[PDB]
Ligand binder design. Structure first.
Ligand SMILES: Nc1nc(=O)n([C@@H]2CS[C@H](COP(=O)(O)OP(=O)(O)OP(=O)(O)O)O2)cc1F
Ligand SMILES: [Mg+2]
Lengths: 358, 983, 363
DNA sequence: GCGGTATGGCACTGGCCCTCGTTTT
DNA sequence: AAAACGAGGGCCAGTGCCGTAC
């Protein structure tokens, strides 16, 4: 709709005129991403790795090869995690069931001639005994659903479906309502030991891990989420005469932007540079609109900063060079406020830290 | 042509003054000495139309010039002397700008205090400087108090604008400002930073005090100790340069009170306004005391320094000017970055060595370490007190699953954790340093509650006394030590006994690992104490040392580090590289404060010469500004310049970090600096003081002939002739000669020449004995040389003859002592007496060397003044734009423009010629040699430096950065006359 | 050339015996271990911090791994060049400005027929022709400075000034491996040739405002191999004469170190208020510091064993929780740089770790 | 029989004064 | 419960070596 056009003028996506359709975006075919989309994906992947690093006991990060080891590109992100299974058995001391998480750029064929598409997906291979495989699968189902639910503006938009077959005893797929069509966002399967037993026969005496004075070949849980589809999901979830993207604070790429109000004066640039350094010193993404070079209107400026999903806009007028007061302006409430420049850092940090809840 | 060297001059037709007997004695002297192998190489004579002389001699020329150049300022000073003082106001006005206090101390809002002359002392809050905040100035008419814009609470942004105090009056005579350390106040003047100007000059009471009744640093050291038989008679006739002390000296009134809180340097802007009235009062007391002191000093200074040349010379020497731009800020940033990087590397390596050496604490294996056994090696674990009771020991008091139903057990463990946390805080008190680590490691760490805490062991050094012993091997030996001196190095049988006993309890001292280390070293008390290197057992004593001071630590022994002995381990070339790192940042370590804090005011595009704007340089949104060097006009000795930063500014070395500091003074576009370096001044001065005393001509001495014989251009000077003996070129030979003139001590010349030549002591001693011929000879029981033909006699009464003393043969130290024996002013020539504390009247005086040095260096400073007034005389008379001066003792650089540079260099040559002729005339005859009349090197370019070609370290590429090139000069500048119409 | 056993025992690399210098330098290695990919993670993050975040006019770019028209990308420069116009639009034509990206590249290798992939962090700096060489020297000095820190011996990393076949100036960065120097990062000044070839039609959309005039941007480029860099720091961390006593430990910089602290249980056995360890665990990971859990263990062995086990993993500090700490509240601590026992408080330990890393980042 | 004239910095040290715990109404 | 004395760390100035220039 009118969302795909505000992602072009605000550089969420790459420059395109024909491959800007929803079908091409759902496809791996690209025209990749603009800086905003890249930062959004990086924050998303960071929160993904954070939502699995808090998980007890221990999950080890790995990286798989992209091409075929014997000469070709990878489709799934399971094989490379299965290759490092026997190795990562030593680090866990073969003690308990354990997993391996990894985020990578996987490929898939897209159909004149046919081409190839890319997608950045995050996978988790959870090795666990067959008797406690299904329960842990339901566990991961709940935790992943809640994971998508946290940063969501609406929990009803994300759905969870159950399924099964002959190869997979029980599997679950996480869908997302658009609502132009519910789409796949993440797959959760419960593959048997067959996949692992196929690449190590044998003598298979290495594969079985200890499970309380018991030797047993572990069943394999296949978690596989898409961060591109997730990015688009949150983008469509944030789209709200107003055209403002209300992305989650912890997820939003740029969370603050500061310009000047008084005419082009060096001192204003000095103060703004100071605030720039102070805000970047505490890990706060800030857009520098004080460069500037003209500072035309304020309404189209706020419109631009709202289409870029900036949490707070800051204005450094000439009064700031006297009292230190500065012009804040929210996004979710769009309230024109004013506060001292020294208490800005603490306010932003506290506001970001207050968004940490489940 | 003629008389072994003279040029075409119109400075007096006669003249000889032949002195046939005298020149017969000189020729006979120079024959037996003996030098009679003349090279006969006549320098190209120059024929040019000299500027108009005023007559009769050049003495009255320079006198009239100096008088007319300093007449208005003398008038103004006289207006200050006969000034009737109006009383201090009952209250100070709290308003921005100037406030005039006239009748009954009323408050009259004024922008600029229009006065012929006034005293001045500015104030500045150091907490957020270097911007002026307060000022007080009294005048022969009334009082004035200036306040800065710091009266309104704002969040200012200091980029050093034109905020400093305004003092100069507009046109569309004239000014004189006196004050204690007047240069600092000058640096806070709004109109002194402009490229053009200025009519306003300054008079320093500190410099004046130094000229009248000054004293050496050695005298200062024991003057303040007042809290060598007749060395305490000058204690009450002179004083230190402090304002309270100089006031207690020249006024002798009640002791002025100083600020007990030091609020301008200890406190902020907040606590200043709370005590504004008081601080204003203090400033008023300061300017008042300064006024009194000035009033009492002016006639005294005029008496002791009768010649106006010194006056005008002191006037122009105070108005220095250094033009700069953004490249200054870039220089600061880059140099500081480099410094922080190298320091990061060094401290990283050292703390790495300190960390891996901390492991040998367990268990008691440090006692075997031949380097690490002197220090602490402590193990603390304190402390706690009992509060829980009673009578029970608190020291001893595989299932697979998948549970998650306890979702809130995490916050249970959290609550348990926090509840456990806030119950132990009252058990200790003040967080001490880490007790687990040894004492030597605790001292090598920053405090935990320190705002600038860095991880691991910091404060590593270089040049400490723990870390050098921590790693370095020691001169073909193993252990190094310190007590009264560190490892002995640089700056008929003898025996010494030995001993070894135990008694308990002292620290265990190993000496087997030492012997084994020596075994490992030679694997590739006596003997081996002379030239080889070895350590004994305990004792401890010298037992074979050369230096009588020691050297903690070896920081300038690179050739004695990159030749085998000595080396470090572990290990490899880490030693010489560490020494390299030390040598690189040696300058920036002891100057970065002075350089970074060195303020600079930027002038906007509205207050600069538009003729520069027309010049094809802006440059690309570039900021142009400047800084006044802030120099004490006259400091001992003799009345030389004294400046914290720019006088100790490092030269252009490809090794030092901030070595570009000298070449950062970049002249504005359209302008260029033209300067020159006297080659040579003090040597030729001593020469003249010898030949003029011996006879009439300039080449009638053994020493004074070689000075004016060599040429630096494709030739060999006297310094260069002594440097090619060999010999070391060239500054070293200079510091050998000039050190010989002012006391050629046998052991000093020994260790010096041996330090510079790097050889063996016997041949060196032979060379010294060969060179000690110059000072030889000299003068009941006594030295076997008197006025009588023989010393041996029987009961011969001659106590009336033991009053004469003087050397013989080559040198002329007899005259330098002749000026050092007079109990009367001793002022040659000119011609200004100094210090009631060094004058042998009522002084022992036992300060001979300082007085010889006083003589020759005073000749150098009067030379400087003469150069100044001479350069000023033909810069205003002719169309030569840019009169701003930048002088460093011998060298002197003027800020001219690109179209008047050659004529300015010509002015420099003329100046040098006239000054040399002055020194020649003051002793006779007016005739002067050839290879000494004119400058040999005249630098003409954008930034000032040493040689015309300049390389550097921090920016790596000089011309790579926005620079140009230099031009040697020369003989080609002798075609552009002083007249405007040239080329 | 014997620390490999330390890399296998503690997985900073693969446990395969076939890990020759060629196999590691070509990028044909089977993959890095968890500690290795974590080390590379923190290294890459430290790149991203001291290149993209602090310096403005630099924005992240997402280049694809292939071409729409099989072989892949050899460098992630071209894909960044493709995003020039849009990134010019978001910066309002204010050059100099750059595009940075950390992506894996694929290099064809004829083993004397295979293909080796390796992660590379590249930055393309679009800069005016008037100040091309200046920015080249600038980035040379700053990249070299970035690589000379974190090192126990900065003397190994060097730079080399070299010219192109045409005359274009460029600089290479080397690290001194035990068998000789090796290229780790390359800097070049491309004379706006490729950009001219990419947009032959309208060259007006390429003009960037230098200041008072629009000019064709000269294309600077710096590509840094983070794999060879990771191996370089891995070698630099490991230790060499008359030391009289040696211990196996690799000294990695506290910033890029894989696991920061290591939590364990002492005395031992103690039940069952050991849930405090979980508290300290989540408290630690909440602040973003890596903590190794020493709970379920088979040792039950000498403290020297797991101490050396932690020093082989370059773990900064070893925090020990015993029953006496359960009584008062003062846990034990053992630093890696200097093996020494030290008592400390809990939240004080947290803030000590945070301050340790934060200050380690500084001077 | 003595190099001189200046400017600074850093490390080390010991004495002044404060604080805080230990010992004491 | 309450008064007193010793141990620890910071602010202070002095001293010993070194840094540079002219
Ligand atoms: N160690 C020194 N003692 C000195 O008294 N001087 C005196 C101080 S002033 C006078 C000028 O110093 P310079 O470095 O210019 O030495 P110079 O003029 O004799 O020789 P040149 O002109 O620089 O070639 O020499 C120099 C020294 F290096
Ligand atoms: Mg000189």
């Amino acid at each position: 709709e009118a969302l795909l056009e505000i992602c072009q003028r605000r550089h969420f996506l790459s420059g395109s005129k024909q491959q800007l359709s929803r079908d091409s975006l759902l496809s791996g075919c690209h025209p990749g991403f603009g800086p905003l989309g890249v930062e959004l994906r990086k924050n998303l992947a960071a929160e993904w790795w954070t939502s699995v690093v808090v998980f007890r006991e221990q999950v080890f990060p790995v990286d798989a090869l992209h091409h075929k080891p014997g000469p070709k590109l990878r489709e799934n992100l399971l094989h490379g995690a299965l290759e490092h299974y026997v190795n990562c058995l030593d680090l866990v001391n073969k003690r308990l069931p354990y997993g391996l998480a990894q985020i990578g750029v996987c490929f898939h064929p897209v159909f004149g001639v046919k081409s190839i598409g890319e997608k950045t997906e995050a996978s988790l291979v959870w090795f666990t005994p067959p008797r406690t495989s299904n329960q842990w699968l339901d566990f991961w189902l709940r935790h992943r659903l809640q994971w998508w639910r946290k940063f969501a503006m609406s929990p009803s938009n994300f759905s969870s479906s159950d399924c099964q077959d002959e190869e997979g005893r029980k599997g679950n797929k996480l869908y997302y309502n658009f609502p132009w069509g519910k789409e796949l966002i993440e797959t959760l399967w419960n593959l048997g030991d067959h996949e692992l037993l196929h690449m190590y026969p044998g003598n298979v005496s290495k594969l079985h891990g200890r499970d309380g004075r018991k030797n047993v070949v572990p069943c394999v849980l296949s978690v596989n989420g898409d961060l591109d589809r997730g990015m688009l999901a949150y983008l469509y979830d944030s789209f709200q005469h107003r055209k403002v993207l209300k992305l989650h604070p912890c997820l939003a790429p740029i969370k603050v932007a500061l310009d000047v109000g008084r005419g082009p004066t060096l001192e204003l640039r000095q103060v703004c540079q100071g605030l720039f350094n102070e805000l970047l010193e505490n890990g706060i993404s800030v857009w520098p609109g004080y460069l500037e070079t003209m500072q035309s209107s304020l309404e189209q400026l706020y419109s631009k900063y709202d289409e870029m999903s900036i949490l707070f806009t800051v204005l450094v007028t000439e009064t700031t060079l006297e009292n230190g007061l500065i012009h804040l302006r929210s996004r979710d409430t769009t309230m024109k406020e004013m506060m001292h420049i020294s208490k800005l850092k603490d306010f932003l940090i506290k506001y970001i830290s207050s968004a940490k809840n489940v | 042509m003629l008389s072994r060297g003279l040029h075409e001059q119109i400075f007096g037709q006669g003249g000889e003054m032949p002195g046939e007997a005298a020149v017969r004695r000189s020729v006979e002297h120079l024959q037996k000495h003996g030098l009679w192998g003349q090279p006969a190489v006549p320098l190209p004579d120059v024929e040019l139309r000299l500027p108009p002389l005023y007559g009769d001699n050049l003495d009255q020329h320079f006198r009239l010039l100096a008088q007319k150049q300093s007449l208005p300022y003398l008038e103004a000073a006289n207006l200050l002397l006969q000034a009737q003082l109006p009383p201090k106001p009952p209250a100070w006005a709290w308003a921005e700008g100037w406030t005039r206090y006239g009748p009954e101390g009323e408050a009259v809002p004024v922008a600029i205090p229009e006065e012929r002359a006034l005293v001045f002392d500015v104030e500045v809050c150091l907490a957020e400087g270097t911007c002026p905040t307060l000022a007080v100035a009294i005048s022969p008419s009334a009082w004035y108090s200036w306040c800065s814009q710091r009266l309104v609470e704002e969040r200012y942004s200091w980029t050093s604008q034109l905020s400093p105090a305004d003092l100069i009056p507009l046109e569309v005579q004239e000014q004189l400002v006196v004050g204690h350390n007047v240069s600092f106040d000058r640096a806070h003047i709004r109109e002194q930073y402009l490229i053009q100007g200025s009519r306003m000059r300054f008079l320093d009471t500190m410099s004046m005090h130094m000229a009248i009744s000054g004293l050496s640093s050695f005298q200062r050291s024991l003057w303040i100790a007042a809290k060598a038989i007749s060395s305490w008679d000058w204690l009450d006739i002179s004083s230190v340069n402090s304002l309270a002390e100089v006031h207690r000296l020249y006024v002798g009134g009640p002791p002025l009170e100083k600020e007990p809180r030091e609020l301008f340097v200890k406190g902020t802007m907040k606590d200043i306004r709370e005590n504004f009235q008081d601080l204003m009062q203090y400033c008023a007391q300061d300017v008042w005391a300064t006024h009194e002191v000035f009033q009492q000093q002016l006639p005294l200074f005029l008496e002791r320094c009768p010649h106006p040349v010194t006056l005008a010379g002191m006037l122009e020497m105070g108005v220095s000017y250094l033009p700069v731009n953004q490249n200054w800020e870039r220089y600061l940033a880059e140099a500081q970055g480099t410094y922080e990087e190298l320091q990061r590397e060094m401290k990283k390596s050292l703390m790495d060595l300190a960390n891996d050496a901390c492991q040998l604490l367990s268990g008691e294996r440090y006692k075997e370490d031949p380097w690490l056994w002197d220090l602490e090696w402590d193990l603390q674990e304190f402390k706690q007190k009992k509060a829980k009771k009673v009578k029970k020991e608190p020291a001893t008091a595989l299932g697979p699953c998948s549970e998650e139903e306890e979702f809130q057990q995490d916050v249970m463990a959290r609550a348990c954790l926090q509840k456990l946390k806030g119950t132990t805080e009252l058990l200790p008190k003040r967080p001490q340093h880490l007790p687990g680590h040894p004492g030597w490691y605790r001292k090598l760490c920053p405090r935990l509650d320190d705002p600038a805490w860095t991880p691991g062991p910091s404060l590593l050094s270089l040049q400490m006394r723990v870390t050098p012993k921590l790693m370095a091997l020691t001169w073909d030996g193993f252990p190094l030590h310190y007590s009264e001196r560190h490892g002995w190095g640089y700056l008929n049988l003898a025996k010494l006994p030995t001993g070894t006993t135990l008694e308990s309890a002292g620290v265990v001292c190993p000496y087997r690992a030492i012997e084994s280390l020596y075994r490992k070293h030679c694997l590739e008390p006596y003997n081996d104490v002379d030239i080889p290197g070895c350590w004994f057992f305990k004792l401890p004593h010298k037992d074979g040392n050369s230096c009588n001071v020691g050297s903690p630590f070896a920081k300038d022994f690179l050739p004695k580090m990159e030749d085998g002995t000595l080396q470090a381990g572990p290990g490899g070339a880490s030693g010489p590289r560490a020494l390299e790192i030390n040598k690189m940042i040696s300058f920036w370590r002891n100057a970065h404060k002075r350089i970074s804090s060195q303020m600079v005011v930027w002038l906007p595009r509205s207050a600069l010469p538009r003729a520069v704007i027309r010049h094809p340089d802006y440059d690309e949104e570039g900021l142009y500004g400047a800084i006044l060097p802030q120099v004490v006009t006259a400091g001992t000795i003799t009345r030389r310049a004294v400046e914290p930063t720019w006088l100790t500014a490092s030269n252009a070395r490809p090794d030092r970090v901030g070595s570009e500091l000298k070449a950062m003074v970049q002249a504005p576009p359209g302008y260029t600096l033209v300067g020159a370096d006297v080659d040579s001044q003090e040597l030729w001065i001593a020469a003249v003081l010898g030949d003029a005393h011996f006879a009439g001509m300039h080449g009638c001495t053994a020493f004074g002939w070689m000075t004016l014989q060599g040429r630096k251009s494709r030739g060999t000077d006297l310094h260069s002739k002594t440097a090619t003996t060999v010999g070391i070129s060239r500054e070293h030979a200079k510091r050998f000669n000039y050190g010989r003139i002012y006391g050629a001590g046998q052991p000093f010349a020994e260790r010096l020449l041996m330090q510079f030549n790097h050889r063996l002591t016997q041949q060196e001693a032979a060379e010294k004995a060969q060179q000690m011929y110059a000072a030889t000879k000299g003068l009941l029981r006594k030295v076997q040389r008197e006025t009588a033909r023989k010393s041996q006699w029987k009961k011969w009464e001659v106590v009336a003859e033991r009053a004469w003393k003087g050397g013989t043969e080559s040198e002329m130290f007899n005259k330098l002592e002749s000026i050092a024996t007079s109990d009367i002013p001793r002022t040659p020539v000119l011609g200004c007496c100094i210090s009631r504390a060094l004058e042998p009247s009522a002084v022992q005086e036992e300060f001979m060397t300082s007085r010889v040095n006083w003589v020759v260096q005073s000749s150098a400073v009067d030379y400087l003044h003469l150069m100044l007034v001479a350069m000023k005389w033909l810069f205003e008379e002719f169309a030569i734009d840019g009169r701003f001066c930048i002088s460093i003792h011998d060298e002197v650089r003027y800020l001219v423009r690109e179209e008047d540079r050659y004529r300015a260099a010509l002015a420099l040559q003329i100046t040098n010629l006239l000054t040399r002729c002055m020194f020649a005339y003051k002793l006779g005859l007016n005739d002067l040699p050839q290879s000494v009349a004119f400058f040999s090197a005249v630098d003409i370019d954008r930034c000032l430096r040493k040689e015309v070609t300049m390389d550097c370290k921090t920016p790596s590429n000089p011309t790579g950065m926005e620079r140009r090139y230099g031009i040697p000069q020369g003989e080609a500048l002798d075609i552009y006359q002083i007249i405007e119409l040239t080329k």
